[PDB]
């Protein structure tokens, strides 16, 4: 029973879209973490979906279209 957003089983008023870690996106009122290879952004969302090719910027390397941990 949640009136606003859910992070796991917790009812929360906001997700970590613009601040807080891990950064999150929203799907059907669920807070979900951005892929860990997306670099947290200051001034914009960090992801628009779950995948490593939906980040605004990559935290380490990029193997287009994917952000990746290790040098391609």
């Amino acid at each position: 029973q949640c009136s606003q957003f859910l992070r796991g089983q917790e009812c929360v008023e906001e997700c970590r879209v613009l601040q807080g870690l891990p950064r999150e996106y929203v799907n059907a009122r669920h807070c979900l973490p951005c892929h860990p290879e997306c670099q947290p952004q200051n001034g914009s969302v960090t992801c628009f979906g779950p995948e490593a090719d939906q980040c605004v910027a990559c935290a380490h390397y990029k193997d287009p279209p994917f952000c990746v941990a290790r040098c391609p």
């Binding site: 606003q4 008023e13 613009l18 001034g43 914009s44 969302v45 628009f48 995948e51 910027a57």
Partner: protein, 265 residues
């Protein structure tokens, strides 16, 4: 703006929800409590999503407010935000804004994030964003814009995200994106666009994601040549509403064939 003598919260902020908000923010015991200007000066962050706020009258007394999360309320007037010069994040999504005062953002020159989505904006004033030289994200999703003023984004040279989906856009002004060389994310889906200006995307050299779906693209030649050739040359940039790479997501009206499938003689 400054209060000179201690004043009840309820009197500074006449909206019952917003007075409750200030009270919780300052951890007071009731909206009848009097507050000082130094207490109001302490407010850096207001977060009151879905709080039934109908007016933010009184917020002009918060000179240091920097983050303003007001999504999902009932605002139709934002005149009292005009001189909150330390604002960096202003979220007004999901309110009842039908229009914006001319020059309402002109003093908010530190704004980075300006979200105006899910309102009922019928138009944008000429030059409404011109002073927001540091803006990095602008969202206008789910409004009722049918056109944009020429050059409305030209001063937003640092813009990284621009969301224009779910409007009623009939056309894009020539050159409208020409200054957005840092733009990475552009939503244009679910509008009434039958064409774009030739070359409209050609300065968007940082663009990584674009949404073009659910527009009635006129795929007759030669008008469709630029958009067809652009998509073919940027087939990994186009995303469908689900968020996946889908260059075929931009469809011709009538036939439903993919725009990028059209070849002009």
């Amino acid at each position: 703006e400054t209060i000179t003598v201690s004043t009840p919260i309820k009197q500074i902020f006449p909206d019952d929800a917003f007075a409750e908000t200030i009270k919780a923010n300052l951890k007071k015991k009731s909206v009848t409590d009097a507050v000082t200007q130094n207490e109001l000066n302490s407010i850096d962050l207001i977060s009151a999503p879905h709080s039934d706020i109908k007016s933010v009258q009184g917020i002009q007394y918060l000179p240091n407010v920097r983050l303003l999360y007001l999504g999902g309320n009932k605002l139709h007037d934002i005149s009292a935000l005009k001189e909150l010069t330390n604002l960096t994040t202003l979220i007004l999504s999901g309110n009842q804004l039908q229009s914006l005062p001319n020059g309402v953002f002109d003093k908010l020159t530190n704004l980075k994030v300006l979200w105006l989505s899910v309102n009922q904006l019928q138009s944008l004033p000429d030059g409404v964003f011109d002073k927001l030289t540091n803006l990095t994200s602008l969202r206008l999703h789910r409004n009722q814009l049918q056109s944009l003023p020429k050059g409305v984004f030209d001063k937003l040279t640092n813009l990284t995200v621009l969301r224009l989906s779910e409007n009623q856009l009939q056309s894009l002004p020539e050159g409208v994106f020409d200054k957005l060389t840092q733009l990475k994310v552009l939503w244009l889906g679910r509008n009434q666009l039958k064409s774009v200006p030739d070359g409209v995307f050609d300065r968007l050299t940082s663009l990584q994601y674009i949404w073009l779906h659910d527009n009635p693209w006129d795929c007759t030649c030669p008008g469709i040549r630029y958009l067809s050739e652009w998509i073919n040359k940027h087939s990994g940039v186009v995303r469908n509403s689900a968020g996946s790479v889908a260059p075929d997501s931009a469809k011709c009206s009538g036939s439903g064939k993919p725009v990028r499938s059209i070849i002009c003689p």
